[PDB]
Amino acid sequence: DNRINRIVILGGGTAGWMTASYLAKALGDTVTITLLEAIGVGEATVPNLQRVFFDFLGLREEEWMPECNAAFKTAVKFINWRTPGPGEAKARTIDGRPDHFYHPFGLLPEHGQVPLSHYWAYNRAAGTTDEPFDYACFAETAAMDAVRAPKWLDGRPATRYAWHFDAHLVAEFLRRHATERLNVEHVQGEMQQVLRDERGFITALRTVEGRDLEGDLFIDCSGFRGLLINKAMEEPFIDMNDQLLCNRAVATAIKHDDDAHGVEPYTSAIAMRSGWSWKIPMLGRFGTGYVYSSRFAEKDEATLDFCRMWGLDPENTPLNQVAFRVGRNRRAWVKNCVSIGLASCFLEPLESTGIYFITAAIYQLTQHFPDRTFALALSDAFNHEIEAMFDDTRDFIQAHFYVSPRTDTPFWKANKDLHLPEQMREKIAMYKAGLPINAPVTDESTYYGRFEAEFRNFWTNGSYYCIFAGLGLRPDNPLPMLRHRPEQVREAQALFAGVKDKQRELVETLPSNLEFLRSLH
Template sequence: MNSRRIRKAVILGGGAEGWMTAAHLGKALQGTVDLTVLESPHDTAPPIASGVGTLPHLHRCFFDPLGINEDEWMRECGAGFKTAVRFVNWRTEGPGSAEPRQLPTGSSDHFYHSTGLLPDCEGLPLSHYWFKRKHEGRTQDPFDYACFREPPLLDAKLAPRWLDGRAATRYAWHLDAALLADYLRRFTTAKHDTHVVVGELAGADRDEHGRLTALRTTEGHVLDADLFIDCSGYEGALINGVLAEPFEDLSGELLCDRAVVARIPHNDRAEGVDPYTSAVAVPSGWAWKIPLRGSFSTGHVHHSSLTTEDEARAELSTLWGLDAERTAFDTLDLRVGRTRRTWVDNVIAVGRSAGSLGPLQSTGSHFLVAALHRLVTHFPDRDFDPALADSYNRETDEIFADSRDFVQAHLAFAPRTDTAFWRAGKERELPAGLRRKADAYRAALPVNPVATDEAAYYGSHGNAEAELHNIWTDGHYYSVLAGLGTEPRTALPVLAHRPESVAAADQLFTAIERQQRNLLDTLPTAYDCLRNLYEG
C-alpha cells in the first residue's frame, strides 16, 4: 500500500454541494479516506427558494453508483420530472407574461430545449435535414417539434415515463436542494461513516510550503487533514479566501449577479404539474419557474447595474399574479464567473466556489457532477504531483468555457432589444469559442460534432465521462439558436449530393410524428405519475 496515500480529507461546507461531494467520495474511495464535513449552522437552514433543476446525467453518474434507486431518492428529495426548459417570450418585446405572445409569423413565442436526444441520420444530426426542408419550403414545423418527440408531450404536461417506472424518453429532475442535502447527510454518515462537525470557519493553519494542515472553527475545533475540499459556495472561503486565488467576474458578460426569489403555493391537482423548467423573458431580465410538490420556486434574474430589487420584485409579482406586499421574497447575490485555478496545492474547489454561470440551463448541476468524477480520476497522494492539478484545472477550464459559450448564446442571439437589459446582451463581444461555434452554425456545419445516439449516454462508463466533459452538442445549440429565430444562411451543401440520406431523414421525421401520437395516447400526466410515485 502507498505509504503516501491520502488518509484524511475535510470538506468545508454542507448543503447539497458538500454532501454530494462526501457521498461520492465515500463510495468511490471505498472507505480508505477518513472524511469529515465541516458544516456551518447556516447550511442546514432551508433557503426560501430551494428548488433546482438538474441535467439527465444526475442519476446515472451520481445516484446509481451509490446504489440508490431513482424512486427512493426522488421521494426523499421532493423531486419531479424535468423533460425540457421552456423558453417563453425571448423573441417578442413587451411586459412580462407567463403566456407566450404571438410572433409575426403567427406562431407562438415559445420553444423547448429538450433533454431528449437529437436523432442522427447517416452520420449527420437531424437538425441539418430539418433546415434543408425548411429552407426549401417543405416544412413550417419549428425545430423542436419536428426533431424531438417531447414537445407535444410537454404541451400536454405528460410524464416522461409510464406508471410502472419504464422511461419513455430521456429526462432530468426538479428537486428541493434542502431535502437533497438532508437526505445525503443521513445516507453518507450512516453508509460511509462520514464525520460531521458543526461550526464556523475561523482560520486555517499552513505548513512551511503553504499547504493547509488544519481548519479551525470559532467553537474551538481543529480539523487536520491531508486534503481540503472547498464546498463553501459563492464565498470560496478556502480557495479565494485563505489561498487568495483570483476570481474572474463574468457577471457583466452574462448580465447576471442577483436574483429576487420566492416560493409560491400551487394546486397540483387542479392546475397540473409542469414537466419542464420555465425561463420567461421579462423587461429587465428573465424569470425561472421550477415545479415542486405543492409549490413552485421562482426567481427574477438580472444585473444590479440595470435593475433595482424593487423593480425585480414588481416584475416577478406581475408575472405570477402575486401580492407583492404579502409574498415572502429573498434576494440572492450571484457570484458569476470562475476561480482561476480550482486546484491549488492541497485545496480543491468544487461547486460554486470553483465557478458559476448563474441558474440558466442547470450548469451548476453539470459542473458539480463532472468535478466529482474528475476529482476521483485525478485523486492525489500526499506528494501532490503538479501534473494531476494541471490536468484537473485544464479540464475544468475546458468545461467551463464550453458552458459559458452556451449560456451567453441565449442573450447574444435573443432578438429582443426593447430594454437596457436586452440591448446589453448584444453589446458584449462574444468569446472566441462562441464566435467559432456561431460561424459554424451559420455555415450549416455541426457546432459540436459528437455522437448523439443513445449508446453515447447509456453505454459504457467511458461514454458517461464523455457526456460529462462535453454536453453542449449540436442539438443543444440548434434548440436554442433556432428557437430564438437564428438560422443558417443556407442548407448544408453536401446534402444536395445525398438524396438517399435526405429520403431516409424524411422517413425519420415521419417516424417521430408517429411516436409523438403514440406517446400522447399512452403516457400519464406528470401529476398522475408523481401521485403514483409518492402515494403508491
Template structure:
C-alpha cells in the same frame, strides 16, 4: 482503485458540501477504506478506518438553497450512491424534467403576449436519432433560405413527452430515455446529509476562525467550537465566500461578468400547480429571465437579473406582478441573492480542492450547478487514481475543469447574444456590449455565412460541453435566420408521426398518455 486520503475535511454544507461528502464516502466504501460496524441501536453504518471524512457546517451562514433544477447527470450520481430514484424523489418533492421551454427570448417590440415566440431545449436520447436527423436537415434547409418545419416538438422525444405529459418512468428501461429532475434544494440537502452521516461522515457545526497556510497547502483549520482540525485533504464547499481557496490561498478568479451580465436573483414560491408539466419554463422579462419549476408541494419561481439595469426592489416588484394572477402574494416573502459569475483558475493544488460555488458559478439558466459539482468530484477521483506526480494530476484536473466552465459559459452566452428584443436597454446590451467568447463567435460566423455547420462543430469540438443537438436547437430556436426566399420543402416523411409512433411502442404496459 487507489484509496482516498486518510483524513478529509469538508468546509461548508449545502448541496455542494453534502454531495461531496456522499460521493467521497461512497468512493471510500468502494475502495475498502470504510468498514461496517454495528451500533448499540442495532443500526448499521460505516465508519472510517483508512479514511475519515468530516464536514464542518456553519450554523450562522445560510446556504443558497434555491437551486431547483438539474441536468440528466444527476441520475448517475444517485445510481453511484445506490439510491433508488423513487426514494430520493419522494423525500425531496421532486418531479421529472425533460428539458427547458424558452419563452419570449426573441420577442419583438410589437409582438402581442399571445404570439410570444418560444422554443424547447430537449434532453437528447437514442430514440431521437431517426427523427433528429430530419430536424438537422430541416434547419440547414432553413439556413439556406428554404421554408421548412423546424419545430423541436416534431422531432425530439423529450418535447413530445412534455406535450403529451408522459413521465419517463412510464417508458421501458431499454429505451434509455435521458431526463433530469426538479427538486426542493433544502430537502435535497437534508437527504444527502442523512445518507452521508449514515455512511460514517462526521458532521460538525461551527465556524472557521483561522486558516494557517504554507505555499499551496493548508496547515490546519482553526474553529470556534472544535479546536484545530487537521487533514490530508481540505475541500472548500463554503460557497461564494471561498474561505479556503479564495481567501486563505488567494487563488485567482476569471470573471465572466463581461459576457454574462446577470448577477442577482429573487425567488418567490407559489402554490403547487394542478397539472405538473415535465419541463422548466424560462420566461424572458425586462432585465433578465424568470424560472418556473413545478414541484410536488409547490412551484418554484425566481427572477435572474442584472443589477446594472434593475434594482432588487424593481426586480421583486416585476416578479410579483407576473406571478400575482388572482393570488395574493403580499404575505409571501421573497429571497434575494447575489451571484458571482466566473471561475477559479486553480481548483486543486497542494492539499486543497474547491468544489461548488467556491470554485465557480455560471448563472442558473441551464441548471448546471449540481452537474459541475458532480463532474468535479468524478474528475477528482479519476485524477487521484493516475500514477503520475501530484503536479501533473493538478494540471490535468484544473485544465479540464476550466474547459468545462468555459464551455458551459459559451452556451449560456448564446442565449443572450441571440436575443432579438429591443424593449429594454438590458436586452440591447446583451447583443451589443457582450464580450463574445471565441468559440461562440466562430460558430456564429460559420452559421451566418452558410458554411457546413457539422464541420464547424467538429472544428471546435475540444471546447464544447453542449453537443450538436443543443447548438442546433438554440440557433434555430432563437431564429438566427435570414427571411426565407425559396419554395417550401415538400416533406416525404412525417417526423412528428414517427416520433409519436416510437413513443407509443416504448411505453410500458398499462400506462396511458395523459
C-alpha cells in the same frame, strides 16, 4: 506510505454532502472524512445525475426522489425570448404561434450521416414546411405540451429526462446517508481559523470550540464566501460579468393547484425586461426566481416585476434576495485545497448546470486524486478540465442572449454589444453555412452512461439548433452536400413522419406527470 489519510470538507450544503457521500463511497475505510457545517426555490438538473452520482452510491430513483419531493424535467422551455413586452408568464404570439421553444435532452437521429436537424433546415429552405425545429424533430415536445410524465406508471421508459428537486432536502438526505452509512463525521460549528504550514499547505481547520480538524486534503464547499480557496489560499476570482450581465436574483416558491393544469415536466426560462425568470415545478408547488442585471434594473423594480408576473402581493410574500458572483476561480484546486460548487464557479442556472458542475468536479477529483506529495500534474490536469467545462457552458449561455432578436429594453440591447468569443463566432458561422456543430458520435445510452463521453462534447449539435433555431436563426442555406444527395432527402422524410407518429402515441398513452408524481410521493 504517501496515501491521503484524512479529508476535511468545509461546507454542509448540497456541494458539501455530495462531495462527502461520493468520496466516502469511493475511498471506503482507507480515508477518514470529516465535514464542518455551520425558502426552497427549486433546482433543476441534467440527465447524467443518476448515472454519475446516485448510481455510484447505490441509490435508485424510487428511493431518493420521495425524500426530496423530486419531479421530472424533459427540457428547458424558453418563453418570450423573441418577442418584446413585459415580464409575463404565458408566451406571446409571434406570427400565429406562441413564442416558446423547447431545449430537450434526446439526441437527434441521423440519416446518411446527417443529423435530423439538417433535413429540417433543408425543408424550411425549400419552403415546404413552416414547422418549428423543436416540434418537427423532437417527439418530447408534444408530450410536454400535454404535461405527460417521461415514463409510464410501471416504470416503462419513454423519453430522456432529468430532475427537479428541493436542494436542501437532497443535502439533508445525503447527510443522513453519509453519516449513518458511510461513516462520515459531521461536525457542527463555525470555522475559527485556517492552519497552514511553512509551504502554504493547509494542515487543519480550527473550530470555534478550539477543536483542530486535521487533514491532508481540504475541500472548500463554503459557497460564494470561498473561505479556503479565495480567503485562506488567496486564489483570485475571475469575474465574468463582462459577458453575462445578470448578477442578482429574487426568488420564492408558490403553492400550486396541480389539478387545474397539471405539473409541467420541464423548467421554464421566462424572458423578462432585464433578465429571465426560472420556473421549477414540483408536486404541489413550483420554485421561481427572477435573475436580473443590477446594471439595468433596480432592486424594487425586479421584486415588483417578479411579483407582478405571478400575481403575488409584494408586501406579504417571503422573498430570497441574493446577489451572486459570475465567474470562476483562476484555479479550482490550489495546493491541497479543492473548491467545489459555488466556492469554485457560478453561472446563472439558464441551462441547469450547477449540480452538473458539482458532480463533474467530484468525479474529476477522483480521476485526479492525489497522494500527499501532490504532484502538480494532477491538479493542473484537474484545473484544465474544470476551466474547459465552465468556459464552454459560459459561452453557450451567453449565446442565448446574443442570438435573441430582442432589442426592446436596454438589457436585451446591451447583450448584442458584448464581445462574442471567437469560438462561438466560428460556431455561428458554421451553423449559418449549414454545418453541424459538435455532432454526437455516440449513442444516447452510452452518452449519458459514460461520464467522459458527455464531458468532452457537453453541448452537441441538437442543443445548438434548439437554441439558434428556437431564437429565430436559421442557416443561410442547407448543408451543400444535401444538394448532391436528393435521394437521402426523400428517404429522411420518413424520420419526420416517425416523430409525428411518436408524438401522437406519447400523448395518447403516457400518464400525466401529475399522476406519476402522486404514485411516487
